[PDB]
Scaffold this active site. Structure first.
Site, PDB file in Angstrom:
ATOM      1  N   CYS B 139      70.545 -27.379 162.546  1.00  0.00           N
ATOM      2  CA  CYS B 139      70.984 -27.688 163.909  1.00  0.00           C
ATOM      3  C   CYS B 139      70.488 -26.588 164.828  1.00  0.00           C
ATOM      4  O   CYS B 139      70.192 -25.467 164.356  1.00  0.00           O
ATOM      5  CB  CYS B 139      72.498 -27.769 163.968  1.00  0.00           C
ATOM      6  N   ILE B 140      70.386 -26.935 166.107  1.00  0.00           N
ATOM      7  CA  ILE B 140      69.845 -26.072 167.124  1.00  0.00           C
ATOM      8  C   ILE B 140      70.468 -26.443 168.487  1.00  0.00           C
ATOM      9  O   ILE B 140      70.647 -27.615 168.824  1.00  0.00           O
ATOM     10  CB  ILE B 140      68.306 -26.177 167.194  1.00  0.00           C
ATOM     11  N   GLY B 152      64.983 -23.010 174.294  1.00  0.00           N
ATOM     12  CA  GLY B 152      64.951 -23.962 173.166  1.00  0.00           C
ATOM     13  C   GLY B 152      63.607 -23.862 172.425  1.00  0.00           C
ATOM     14  O   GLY B 152      63.545 -23.701 171.191  1.00  0.00           O
ATOM     15  N   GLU B 173      65.987 -30.986 160.375  1.00  0.00           N
ATOM     16  CA  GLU B 173      66.790 -31.959 159.672  1.00  0.00           C
ATOM     17  C   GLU B 173      66.850 -33.256 160.443  1.00  0.00           C
ATOM     18  O   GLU B 173      67.219 -33.288 161.619  1.00  0.00           O
ATOM     19  CB  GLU B 173      68.193 -31.414 159.462  1.00  0.00           C
TER      20      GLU B 173
END
Ligand SMILES: CC(C)(COP(=O)(O)OP(=O)(O)OC[C@H]1O[C@@H](n2cnc3c(N)ncnc32)[C@H](O)[C@@H]1OP(=O)(O)O)[C@@H](O)C(=O)NCCC(=O)NCCSC(=O)CCC(=O)O
Ligand SMILES: [Zn+2]
Lengths: 28, 274
Positions: B139-140, B152, B173
């Site tokens: 996740c980011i 980002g 992912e």
């Protein structure tokens, strides 16, 4: 190791190991 | 139910619901410590914590530093409470986050911007310690107050930097969100155009590109087609170097470098953890 999805309404299948030729503009 | 968060000097409207204890989740606002991420019921409670709280930056190891911009590697097994707070805080802006309780098998890479009061949270990404699918990001998130400013892209760039240093190929992912997909596409376009601006050989395999960039061959191929650079003339597959795209990208690279919204490999001091 191969991949697919169409280009210009034609379904194609490609390898990730075979060298692909790079080209600039050239009449095609 | 939670509508906003006080976070340092910012007041942030939440996007989705996150499973905070119903004691807290009953309230509209949630005060939290910008350095340890503990959450609290009231402004006055926070002020007492801030007067006590020692932490001026995330836990874990500073593996990147370039002036005021840092990255800290936090082990979810050595800092469970911090990583759980971080995951609860993330689910406020992720439509769907896979996991918030079992943070022990994850690393978290926390990006911060320092001013004179401490190292402030910009965003982060979680990474599986040992992923069967060779995912390099689980996740980011870029904190809202910092969104749409290039951070980002700096986080994505960092996840691939780690992959190169590990001598692995990586991918985020699945499934990717809308915002995730747009940002990875932008990044992948930029990496591909840069590579082709620098290659001089007459030919290149996808694997060659993957090896240098740590980008997964499917995302490479996928981006080529997104750019309409994969052609089929005279019975063979060609890569078309579009002059427009490389030209347009150069102007964009000038603007990114004119600011400093770029990660610099010579500022990474890292060896993989295990
Ligand atoms: C995805 C990020 C990290 C993007 O961060 P930033 O906004 O700082 O990105 P940036 O570096 O400034 O710019 C990245 C590119 O995306 C564009 N861009 C950014 N935000 C945009 C928006 N709302 N709308 C349209 N375009 C946008 C920018 O113009 C730029 O494109 P150009 O350069 O071309 O102009 C953020 O939006 C975020 O945290 N969203 C909430 C969490 C999330 O969605 N995470 C990703 C889910 S993917 C995942 O695997 C996790 C889900 C899970 O499995 O649990
Ligand atoms: Zn604290």
């Amino acid at each position: 190791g191969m991949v697919e999805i169409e280009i210009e309404g034609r379904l194609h299948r490609i390898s990730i190991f075979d060298p692909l030729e790079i080209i600039l503009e050239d009449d095609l | 139910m939670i509508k906003t968060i006080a976070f340092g000097r910012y007041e942030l409207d939440t996007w989705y619901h996150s499973p905070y204890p119903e004691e807290y989740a009953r309230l509209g606002r949630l005060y939290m410590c910008e350095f340890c991420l503990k959450y609290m019921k009231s402004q006055t409670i926070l002020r007492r914590h801030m007067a006590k709280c020692v932490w001026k930056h995330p836990p874990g190891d500073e593996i990147y530093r370039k002036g005021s911009i840092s990255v800290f590697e936090v082990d979810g097994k050595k800092n469970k409470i911090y990583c759980q707070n971080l995951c609860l805080l993330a689910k406020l802006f992720l439509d769907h986050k896979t996991l918030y309780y079992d943070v022990e098998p994850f690393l978290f890479y926390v990006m911060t911007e320092a001013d004179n009061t401490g190292c402030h949270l910009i965003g982060y990404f979680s990474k599986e310690k040992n992923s069967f699918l060779n995912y390099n990001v689980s996740c980011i998130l870029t904190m809202p107050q910092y969104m749409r400013q290039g951070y980002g892209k700096m986080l994505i760039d960092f996840s691939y930097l780690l992959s190169k240093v590990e001598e692995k190929v990586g991918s985020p992912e699945r499934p990717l969100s809308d915002l995730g997909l747009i940002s990875y596409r932008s990044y992948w376009k930029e990496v591909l155009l840069r590579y082709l601006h620098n290659f001089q050989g007459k030919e290149i395999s996808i694997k060659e590109i993957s090896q240098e960039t740590a980008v997964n061959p499917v995302d490479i191929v996928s981006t080529l087609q997104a750019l309409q650079m994969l052609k089929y003339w005279k019975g063979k597959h060609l890569v078309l170097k579009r002059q427009d795209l490389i030209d347009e990208w150069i102007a964009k690279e000038a603007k990114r470098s004119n600011s400093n919204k770029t990660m610099d490999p010579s500022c990474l001091k890292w060896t993989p953890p295990k």
